[PDB]
């Protein structure tokens, strides 16, 4: 139940970039409305949103995705990210 | 750098059964040599191995997967589990098919 400190953010991003690099690209494609996503890495996460580095058509744009509900702790972030991954996977397969 | 205590095992297994249920089935399929796995849940994890409950059309079999290298801490476990999931996915991409001739 750790608060979303910058130290926690770097930890979440570090692990998210290696374990769920697939989900990060889906975030950029579905919620970030990015086409032709090659790679996507998480740069930061805070209570109100997350920042993604999206590689596309030989170009590295950084986008920001705002959570509808503000996050309070690490567990809150965990639950939103898992749900967003499911929502993204459903839309991508269709 | 948390040691792999029984309390840590319960936490890892809980999260792995929630966010990684797909990868635990690949563990049963690839490393556990189980064919036609319906569901697979992780029951326990310790430095020398992990215990899986594998359901295969009403089988509910408990198998044990022994790690090549003993785990040292929770970070080591984290790394090992990810590589095993990637490896399991890779072998799955090299698909096998019964072969028949014209
Ligand atoms: C933040 C919070 C968190 C935490 C603490 C964690 C922790 C963890 N984890 Fe995690 N994960 C996560 C969040 C997380 N996580 C996510 C979000 C994901 C995603 C899922 C998907 O992909 O969708 C994962 C995912 C995951 C997976 C899957 C991947 C693949 O692809 O296969 C695995 C195996 C893991 C492991 C793990 C471990 C061992 C641990 C302990 C250290 N993970």
Numbering used by the authors:
A (entry chain B): 2 to 95
B (entry chain A): 2 to 103
Question: What does the publication say?
Answer:
Using a phylogenomics-based approach and complementary structural techniques, we identify a family of dimeric hemoproteins comprising a domain of unknown function DUF2470. The heme iron is axially coordinated by two zinc-bound histidine residues, forming a distinct two-fold symmetric zinc-histidine-iron-histidine-zinc site. Together with structure-guided in vitro and in vivo experiments, we further demonstrate the existence of a functional link between heme binding by Dri1 (Domain related to iron 1, formerly ssr1698) and post-translational regulation of succinate dehydrogenase in the cyanobacterium Synechocystis, suggesting an iron-dependent regulatory link between photosynthesis and respiration. Given the ubiquity of proteins containing homologous domains and connections to heme metabolism across eukaryotes and prokaryotes, we propose that DRI (Domain Related to Iron; formerly DUF2470) functions at the molecular level as a heme-dependent regulatory domain. We heterologously expressed and purified the recombinant protein encoded by the Synechocystis gene dri1 (formerly known as ssr1698) and tested the heme-binding ability of this small, soluble protein (96 amino acids, 10 kDa).
His21Ala exhibits a shifted binding interface with a rotated heme ring (~34°) relative to WT Dri1. Calculated Polder OMIT maps with the heme, His residues, and bulk solvent excluded in addition to higher ligand B-factors reflect a loosely bound heme. The loss of His21, and presumably zinc binding, prevents axial ligation to the heme iron by His79. Instead, Asp20 seems most likely to be the side chain interacting with the heme iron, though the distance between the carboxyl functional group and iron is long (~4 Å Fe - O distance). This coordination distance can explain the increased heme rotation and mobility observed in MD simulations, resulting in a weaker bonding interaction and lower heme-binding ability. The His21Ala structure further suggests that zinc ions could bind via tetragonal ligation by His16, Asp20, Glu76, and His79 residues. However, since the Asp side chain can only have one binding interaction (as opposed to the two nitrogen sites in imidazole), zinc-binding might prevent Asp20 from interacting with the heme iron. Such a hypothesis is in line with the abrogation of heme binding by the addition of excess zinc to His21Ala. We observed that all variants with a single amino acid substitution retained heme binding to some extent. Both His21Ala and His21Ala-His79Ala variants displayed a red-shifted Soret peak at 415 nm, which corresponds to a reduced heme iron or a modified heme coordination.
